[PDB]
């Protein structure tokens, strides 16, 4: 048994659907669970399907099995930050014997904010404690914007952040840049 799970990385905007597709080798497999692993936590079974079933649905999730093609999938409708996690599909035979559970390599699903009226802009912020230690903040850009990354061992630019999966409000995109030269203006930074 070998299980192929695609895509490895799935970035999706809140309100849109997400789909993960898996395939298996062993036609004796008859049990196909899905595990969700919240950031920093453990895998937990969230839904499954068996070879007697074609489609099941609950709580905006759809699981499909096409036993003839040895394909199966998970669809999350109306994604929200609470859905950001690592997902694993698996294939097993099952039922007074135990049969191997074989996992896919995983899908890292990141749900991004839906920015209706973007207003991209760059700000300078000062340390609460010290001096002009400073950072640049790029914010209010939409989730389809890509963030350039540095090019120089003296300027640090983060990737864009990921929403806290328990965030309910004030969901915006941002990235930060900082230097230590300065000798470095924020208008340049991004």
């Amino acid at each position: 048994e070998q299980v192929e799970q695609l895509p490895s990385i799935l970035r999706v905007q809140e309100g849109s659907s997400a789909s993960i597709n898996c395939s298996y080798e062993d036609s004796a497999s008859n049990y196909f669970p899905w595990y969700k692993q919240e950031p920093g936590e453990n895998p937990k079974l969230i839904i499954d399907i068996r070879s007697n079933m074609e489609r099941k649905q609950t709580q905006g999730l759809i699981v499909l099995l096409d036993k003839k093609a040895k394909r199966f999938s998970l669809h999350i409708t109306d994604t929200q930050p609470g859905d950001s996690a690592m997902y694993f599909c698996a294939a097993s035979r099952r039922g007074g014997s135990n049969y191997k559970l074989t996992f896919g390599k995983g899908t890292l699903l990141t749900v991004t904010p839906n920015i209706q009226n973007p207003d991209p802009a760059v700000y300078q912020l000062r340390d609460s404690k010290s001096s002009d230690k400073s950072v640049c903040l790029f914010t209010d850009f939409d989730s389809q914007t890509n963030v350039s990354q540095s090019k120089d061992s003296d300027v640090y630019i983060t990737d864009k952040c990921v929403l806290d999966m328990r965030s309910m409000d004030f969901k915006s995109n941002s990235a930060v840049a900082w230097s230590n030269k300065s000798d470095f203006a924020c208008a340049n930074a991004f």
């Binding site: 453990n42 995983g106 207003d119 912020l125 340390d127 983060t158 990737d159 915006s172 941002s174």
Partner: protein, 240 residues
């Protein structure tokens, strides 16, 4: 339930490490997995009952012990850097089908403890320009100079943890990317309403839980022993 111990451990190459799993499910089957980026969950050893174990897909370097129904141990006789990973135990019943996972053990095996450093943490106050344009205020937290690469960052407002308005880098960045040895930085943002930021009775704290050395670890250097610890920075709202 399924519990694991230790939850976090930094070890040196050549040492012996034992990971313990205890279950209260009265489940016949137990499993040890490791999880690594790009490789998914890989089975190391498993057991279909007390007094037996069998090799999984990647048994090499590990032994397992199932002395009783409730206990399943994973033994690293000679810990090596490639054993750096997140390990999960799981239990399941005879005839299937859910596997019930423990909470995970993060293990880092280092060559030596000399490169272990806790983070320095700083909070940066919202820009007047953001406030006037958006009626919102973003605080930035920066944690820098830590190794190994795992921290947990959280935001606290007036003594309670918050999640709304929080956005955190998915991964720490290497401060010196050309080196195997590099220390790490991580940033997080908290966004609040301008009026909440402008109240001087509001207290904001970026908390960084760092995982490092333990209290029964030897330390022979002229700097503070880099133990597991919280490092925080804080800021009060500003009336103008």
């Amino acid at each position: 339930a399924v519990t694991q111990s230790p939850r976090n451990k930094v070890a040196v190459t050549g040492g012996k490490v034992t990971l313990s799993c205890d279950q209260t499910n009265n489940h016949n089957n137990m499993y040890w997995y490791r999880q690594d980026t790009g490789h998914g969950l890989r089975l190391i050893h498993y057991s279909y009952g007390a007094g037996s174990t069998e090799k999984g897909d990647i048994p090499d370097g590990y032994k397992a012990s199932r002395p009783s129904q409730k206990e399943f141990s994973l033994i690293l006789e000679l810990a090596t850097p490639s054993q750096t990973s997140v390990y999960f135990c799981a239990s399941g019943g005879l005839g299937g089908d859910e596997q019930y996972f423990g909470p995970g053990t993060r293990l880092t095996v280092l060559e030596d403890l000399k490169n272990v450093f806790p983070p320095e943490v700083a909070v940066f106050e919202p820009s007047e320009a953001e406030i006037s344009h958006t009626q919102k205020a973003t605080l930035v937290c920066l944690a820098t100079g830590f190794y190994p690469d795992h921290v947990e960052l959280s935001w606290w407002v007036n003594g309670k943890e918050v999640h709304s308005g929080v956005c955190t880098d998915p991964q720490p960045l290497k401060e010196q990317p050309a080196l195997n040895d590099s220390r790490y930085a991580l940033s997080s943002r908290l966004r609040v309403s301008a009026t909440f930021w402008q109240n001087p009775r509001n207290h904001f704290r970026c908390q960084v839980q760092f995982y490092g050395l333990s209290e029964n670890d030897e330390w022979t250097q002229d700097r503070a022993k880099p133990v597991t610890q919280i490092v925080s920075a804080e800021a009060w709202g500003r009336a103008d």
